[PDB]
Paper text:
KtrAB is a cation channel with a nucleotide-dependent RCK domain. The structure of the KtrAB complex revealed a homodimeric membrane protein (KtrB) assembled with a cytosolic RCK octameric ring, formed by the KtrA protein. KtrA binds nucleotides, ATP or ADP.
In the ATP-bound rings, these distances are similar in the R16K (30.8/30.8 Å), R16A (29.9/29.9 Å) mutants and wild-type (30.0/30.0 Å) structures. A clue for the role of E125 is revealed by the 2.7 Å structure of the ATP-bound R16K KtrA mutant. In this structure, there was a distinct additional electron-density in the KtrA intra-dimer interface, between the γ-phosphates of the nucleotide. After careful crystallographic refinement, we concluded that the density likely corresponds to a magnesium ion. The ion is coordinated by six oxygen atoms, adopting octahedral geometry. The coordinating atoms are provided by the γ-phosphate of both ATP molecules, by two water molecules and by the carboxylic groups of the two E125 residues. Overall, we conclude that the ion bound to the intra-dimer interface site is a magnesium ion.
Author numbering:
A (entry chain A), B (entry chain B), C (entry chain A), D (entry chain B), E (entry chain A), F (entry chain B), ...: 6 to 222
Write the structure that this text describes.
Amino acid sequence: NKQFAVIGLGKFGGSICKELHRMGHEVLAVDINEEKVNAYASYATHAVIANATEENELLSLGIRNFEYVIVAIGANIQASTLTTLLLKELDIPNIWVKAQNYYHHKVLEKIGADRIIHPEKDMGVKIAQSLSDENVLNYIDLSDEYSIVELLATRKLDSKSIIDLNVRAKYGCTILAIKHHGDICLSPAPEDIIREQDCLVIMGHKKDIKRFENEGM
Amino acid sequence: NKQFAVIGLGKFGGSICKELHRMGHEVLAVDINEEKVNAYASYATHAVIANATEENELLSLGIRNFEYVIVAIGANIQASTLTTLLLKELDIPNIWVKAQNYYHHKVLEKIGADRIIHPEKDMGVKIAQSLSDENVLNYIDLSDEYSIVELLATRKLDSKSIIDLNVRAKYGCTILAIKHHGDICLSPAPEDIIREQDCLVIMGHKKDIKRFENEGM
Amino acid sequence: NKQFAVIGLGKFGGSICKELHRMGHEVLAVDINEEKVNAYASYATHAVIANATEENELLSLGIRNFEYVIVAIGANIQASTLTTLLLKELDIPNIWVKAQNYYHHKVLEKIGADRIIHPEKDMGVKIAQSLSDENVLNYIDLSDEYSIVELLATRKLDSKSIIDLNVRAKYGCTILAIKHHGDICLSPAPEDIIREQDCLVIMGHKKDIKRFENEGM
Amino acid sequence: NKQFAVIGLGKFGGSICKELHRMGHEVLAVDINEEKVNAYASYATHAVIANATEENELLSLGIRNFEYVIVAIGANIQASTLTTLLLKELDIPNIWVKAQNYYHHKVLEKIGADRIIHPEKDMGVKIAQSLSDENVLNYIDLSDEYSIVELLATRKLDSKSIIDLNVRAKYGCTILAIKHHGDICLSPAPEDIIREQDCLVIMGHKKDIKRFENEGM
Amino acid sequence: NKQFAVIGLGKFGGSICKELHRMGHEVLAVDINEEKVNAYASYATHAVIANATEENELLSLGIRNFEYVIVAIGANIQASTLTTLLLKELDIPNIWVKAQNYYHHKVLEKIGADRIIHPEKDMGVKIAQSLSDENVLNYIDLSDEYSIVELLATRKLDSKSIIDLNVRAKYGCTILAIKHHGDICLSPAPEDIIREQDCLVIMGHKKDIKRFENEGM
Amino acid sequence: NKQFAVIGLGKFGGSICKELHRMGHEVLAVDINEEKVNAYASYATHAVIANATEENELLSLGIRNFEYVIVAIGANIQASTLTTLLLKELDIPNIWVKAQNYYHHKVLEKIGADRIIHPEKDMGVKIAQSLSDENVLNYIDLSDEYSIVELLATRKLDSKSIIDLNVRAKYGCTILAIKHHGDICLSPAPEDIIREQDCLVIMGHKKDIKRFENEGM
Amino acid sequence: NKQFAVIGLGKFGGSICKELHRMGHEVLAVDINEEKVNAYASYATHAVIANATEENELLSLGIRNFEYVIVAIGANIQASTLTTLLLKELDIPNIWVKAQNYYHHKVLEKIGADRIIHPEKDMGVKIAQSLSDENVLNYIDLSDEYSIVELLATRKLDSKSIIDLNVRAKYGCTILAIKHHGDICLSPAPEDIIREQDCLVIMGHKKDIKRFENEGM
Amino acid sequence: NKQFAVIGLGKFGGSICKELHRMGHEVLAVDINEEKVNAYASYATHAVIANATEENELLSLGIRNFEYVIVAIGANIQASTLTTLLLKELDIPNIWVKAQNYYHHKVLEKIGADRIIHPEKDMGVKIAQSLSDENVLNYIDLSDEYSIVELLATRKLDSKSIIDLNVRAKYGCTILAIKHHGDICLSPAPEDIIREQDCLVIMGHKKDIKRFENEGM
Ligand SMILES: Nc1ncnc2c1ncn2[C@@H]1O[C@H](COP(=O)(O)OP(=O)(O)OP(=O)(O)O)[C@@H](O)[C@H]1O
Ligand SMILES: Nc1ncnc2c1ncn2[C@@H]1O[C@H](COP(=O)(O)OP(=O)(O)OP(=O)(O)O)[C@@H](O)[C@H]1O
Ligand SMILES: Nc1ncnc2c1ncn2[C@@H]1O[C@H](COP(=O)(O)OP(=O)(O)OP(=O)(O)O)[C@@H](O)[C@H]1O
Ligand SMILES: Nc1ncnc2c1ncn2[C@@H]1O[C@H](COP(=O)(O)OP(=O)(O)OP(=O)(O)O)[C@@H](O)[C@H]1O
Ligand SMILES: Nc1ncnc2c1ncn2[C@@H]1O[C@H](COP(=O)(O)OP(=O)(O)OP(=O)(O)O)[C@@H](O)[C@H]1O
Ligand SMILES: Nc1ncnc2c1ncn2[C@@H]1O[C@H](COP(=O)(O)OP(=O)(O)OP(=O)(O)O)[C@@H](O)[C@H]1O
Ligand SMILES: Nc1ncnc2c1ncn2[C@@H]1O[C@H](COP(=O)(O)OP(=O)(O)OP(=O)(O)O)[C@@H](O)[C@H]1O
Ligand SMILES: Nc1ncnc2c1ncn2[C@@H]1O[C@H](COP(=O)(O)OP(=O)(O)OP(=O)(O)O)[C@@H](O)[C@H]1O
Ligand SMILES: [Mg+2]
Ligand SMILES: [Mg+2]
Ligand SMILES: [Mg+2]
Ligand SMILES: [Mg+2]
């Protein structure tokens, strides 16, 4: 198993920490706030109150031993930067960091952060795609032009067959799965039917999917 | 003429707003802080300084015209709650709200929020899946048991064929796409090759995909 | 005996608590402030310093055991709401709450508060009726139209008899009691006399009482 | 032309003011906070931003014209005290003041407050009487020993007659009114019936009424 | 000996306390601030940290035992008033208090303060008399019209005799003493001489002294 | 045309200023707080809002014209010090300053303050002399050993004569004046009488006066 | 036409700015605090209130025209860092920055600061050399081993000659100048005399100079 | 060895302290802040948390024993002044102090400070000379007119000989040393060569050096 250290138990770092622990990884949870440590005590291997900008407190944690250190300190950009800097001077292999704004990203780039993350910004985009198009539940982008989309089927599609909805020739797309009442269907045959309020997973060019949406559903 | 309003220009609400505007929608940006309003002025149809807990200022915005209002107020849970309440009493069709913790989600549920979002929590999970398994670039869950995953191909897969990597019989999975040097390939034929550092899109059972990772790549 | 828990020892909750204890009920007084607990220590069965928004501290009090929980937290609406929410998730039979404004009342309604109280507002109305009409000492409303009123008798009524003041036929009212020098007279006979500065208790339609007041006294 | 002024638009002073205005009296609303003044502007003849501890601002209001001034300043005991003092030195006939604690009552007493009110304390007692005895809706005390009480009739009293519920001989009390489905009955005849969930108004000794509750209903 | 308690060790109360102790009186020094108590520990019989508004802490000091209690609390008028009120309810014979402004004096009057003092105001007047008239070192007023004045002798008076300066007939005044080089002369004979920069003590009507000053010196 | 300026309208500086104005002198009132300036506007020739630590604002006042400047700044020792320094560097003839503690006196001494005053300390001593000896109304010290004292005559002295109270031989003191019912008597003859509650002005050695108090009155 | 801009008018940035202006250079003074700007207005070509972390305000200054920008922001490390970053992204040739601590120096290094200065640290060293050795007035280091030092000549050297103080052979040092009563002598001849309290400028090895001090002077 | 006490461990005092300790002197480090003491604990003989304005804490340190006390307290001018004052009243031989502004210097002068220092201001000037003239690395002033300068040699001087650059006759200057690749050359002969990017140390009149710079390099 790998060993992870997560500094900053916010909504983000807390989630990261809780989720890794659930996977059975050795995870060290670190926060300057005692109430936070108490909160996540139950969801990590070790939970320690510590100020990560204090180099002596850092050595006490033995943070040099970890292959992954996740800096999820947000509001205090000085703490985030200074922590990252210390971690870099300690030759930690992979240092992942949560960023607050463009300029925070840049300094983190310059001082040797390995992966920089913008949780809210990324989700904002995802959610906006949903707001604009009530049909989309979730999606993943293969590139700027191609995507896999999970659609909420309407009445227009009720009792329609996959061959009846020819997307491979008509729209250059392919249906990958159907989810009905919780039961899942993968790579359905040309004879398989779709009913309304099912989850329909389609793959193809974005504009072509939007076209299938406007005309098909 | 659909109209979206975004109250609270944080990292989350800001992204949504900026993103909605980019798609060419009518978007109203709203914040109590003037500096925020000045900032997103360039990324919205209209931007207005306003306190969203004040019913009068709310009516003044012409909020009646909007079908969607996104409450992206974070730190101040009271402001978020009261805003949602006011919006609900003004009979706004769809109210989407950013939640801070479990209990904030509960009250928003009870006072009639139409969609509740936890951006940081959701990305924390996603990022953790990446941390444990450096191979995963991005993924989407079809159900509790099934997922679609985009993998960064290793040397073990370099110059290997789709039939050579028999996954449909060997692992019960199916390859959906290959991305090489930027060029994209959909529903690749049995003869198609994979090169190292390409993107490979695989669909199947979570456990079966992970097995392919351990043994296949 | 029933068991009561009172969270928030303000002027209101303090009064509630002190008065119940005087009646010989098992009452638990709860406040986050130590000085408050010390103040009401002498007026409750148990007095405990506790933060009622902390679910663990709540379970420690054993608050699930109580049939009545009175939330008399005022200034901090977030604390009041969150406390009520926790109490509801603990399936407490009767949760009574002090409200700060209209919108605070609404959320408390929505999250399952059983009785909501506005001590100041109710008293404001009562006192205003006194300010407008110096004759009224106290009253109770039977409905929007009918009331029982305690009047301070003037000189105009000095040495007048109940039959001399025919209210049952002249004003459609009835005299219920006379209080003289502290001595009380209930359901006085037609021959009983009233002297000035006595307390006179009359029942009837509000406008009819006001008429008795304008013309009679 | 009686003139009332209300200084301090809290929940208490606000209610009074709003209520006085509703009765069609000349009312002046006064507060140091502008937002409060804007709020009760709609519920007063005139509303003025003013600091009531400033003698000059006080004279500017034309406070000389008012016969009644209500000091509903709460948190800031110094402001309340100083205001009352100033009003007294300006020879205002009637000064009613909201008290925070025993000692605030004492000083207001000594510096010549005409009426001192403890809204929260008074309602706390009232509400406690309701808590212990779910039957009591509202009541009024005639003396330390005698009271008039409005009861919510139970099934034990459903379809029972006034003579059947002989209370004048059995409990030494008298029934004053019955409220059924909204309809009101005053001084009901011996043949009048009571149905469940009706309101029953009883007069007598506190102990005698409570006995009727235990045995009668 | 008498027993004194001094609450509030400011410049004033500190001076009072230090000076009484020097006279060999039993003095209790009281302050809420620990650093103050430490400062005056060396200048009082007993020095105790205490909040004088807390009735229990007051009884612990045994403050009922003292014939004199000096309230020298200044900035916090609420503390000063409330302390005085408590002391009065404890039937303390002589309660002397330091006042901040006219209205503070009035309430202190009303709640039964025995002597009220304005140290700065009184000194301001004294010093102003010095500023206007550089000749006056110190003085005492016998009434609005008569005074005893200590003057700094100028050159105009050098080598002048008391008979040479006839003040009893010319100005209706009398010389009471001469201070030369530190040596003091009381009730000097008509033959006694005054030299410059001596201290000359004169008694008479104020205007007459000013006249002696303008014309004589 | 003498000109006085008073910087710092505290209780001390305010009194001086008000008092100087009353004597008909040209007085300039100066304070950083606008509310203070508005207050003493009525009690000064001119009143100006100004920060006295700012050399420019100081010159703007035309402070060059003043022969006397009184620094009555208290709480902020830095402001007092810096003001005095600036005044001294602007070659103001006489700078009188209010001191907060021993060390503030020392620095003001070193930076050339012309007179240093400790109003509270000085009155504390005076008041203490009154506390120990209720007989003393007011007094003035001629030296370390000699004083002039105004006594409130007791019954022991009622209706007694000056020769009957032989103090010049018996106690080595001399009676300087008698004040009866407001009427004043200077250098009273041997036949003059003293009545109770009169004011008696005695001069002599401190110890001799105190003896007369113990034995004489 | 070289243009210098100084952001942050602290003791350091202020001196630079004032000094650059004195040499007759085009200098722009920049600070977020208005009072600072008003102060150095007289010592700069132009002085502008501006927040230097705001890219827009920065462009508005015409900062593109400047070849040198000095960041003399101290307490707020974030402001200093962000300013430097912005300047670097605006392609300013030379960015000199004042550092607060080791780590601030490191980040400024990484984000491309052209010169980093530690004024206080550098003077601390210099002053310490003066403290240990009262003889040294000022010095400059040529390397880790060699220095040029200005000494205050003692009596031991009074009236002594350069050949008499043979330092080139005896101590391996050379005398570079003598300053007597203000008059200066460069590369003095073997016959030149030194008098006490003159300034003597010596060059050599640090250890050799110190030896000359112990034995020579 | 001498004994030094350094009060105020800032960038300045910290540097002073660290540097003296490195020289092997007995140094006492003093700061009110615990974190500071911990920081410099490793760089001083004794390190003590103390408030230097508290005369008792000062005596506890035994500060009377030291020949040198360095007051390096900056932001708090009151602390700096008051400390210096106390040290002076304790008859400490040499008290060196860090100054904040002109007026702070003046009071420190007046209360008997022995040496006053302005670290930032002095460095500001030095650095400004560098900004104006990129050739100057470092320098020392012998007087207002004469200086020793360390120059960064350009290409214009590459392979030039000292005789080729006749400065003694042409510019009235003399070359004192050459630093090449780290190797140092002192008092080089007329035949010695200079290469670019070497450090060249020249002595003479300032204007004459600037002339050598403009024309020579
Ligand atoms: N110097 C530090 N050392 C350790 N932990 C720190 C330090 N500074 C801040 N933290 C922790 O970082 C955590 C998250 O930071 P914060 O909540 O301010 O950012 P945020 O963007 O609001 O985070 P999120 O969106 O994840 O809630 C906090 O729980 C805080 O205790
Ligand atoms: N009452 C209000 N009316 C309008 N806007 C508000 C109100 N209260 C807060 N805001 C705005 O909402 C925005 C987001 O709030 P905040 O930044 O505290 O949330 P956050 O949890 O940090 O969100 P993010 O993670 O997206 O930055 C802020 O820019 C703030 O100015
Ligand atoms: N989270 C909490 N847990 C327990 N007690 C709390 C909490 N928050 C506030 N309280 C308590 O609530 C009490 C009353 O609240 P507060 O006085 O602020 O409201 P209020 O309307 O002024 O009340 P009142 O009118 O009854 O005096 C306070 O004594 C406070 O200690
Ligand atoms: N000096 C003053 N002059 C005028 N108004 C004042 C002054 N001081 C306070 N007020 C106002 O008085 C009002 C009531 O005071 P506050 O809300 O603190 O009392 P409270 O005990 O909370 O009363 P309630 O329970 O009725 O809300 C406030 O709206 C406040 O703006
Ligand atoms: N509630 C209290 N109980 C006891 N001591 C108190 C209390 N409140 C204030 N004090 C004390 O009163 C003392 C003097 O008050 P303060 O200095 O604020 O008034 P001041 O007018 O500036 O006094 P002075 O002019 O005498 O210095 C302080 O030393 C403070 O500790
Ligand atoms: N820099 C300044 N320039 C002008 N006025 C000032 C300055 N600093 C303070 N003052 C004013 O000086 C006045 C007196 O100061 P302060 O009230 O703190 O002294 P104090 O010791 O309480 O004196 P007192 O006992 O006479 O009230 C205040 O009214 C204040 O507004
Ligand atoms: N964001 C900003 N934009 C412009 N100026 C700023 C900004 N932040 C701070 N300053 C200014 O920079 C100046 C210097 O900062 P500060 O005084 O905190 O540093 P310091 O370490 O005390 O420096 P010094 O020792 O030179 O006084 C201040 O006068 C301040 O007004
Ligand atoms: N009363 C005091 N007694 C002892 N130390 C003190 C006292 N007051 C302040 N100090 C210390 O003085 C030190 C330096 O002061 P400060 O940093 O405020 O000035 P500065 O000019 O910013 O200093 P520098 O430029 O040297 O960093 C601080 O470490 C602080 O703890
Ligand atoms: Mg966030
Ligand atoms: Mg209340
Ligand atoms: Mg004072
Ligand atoms: Mg500094």
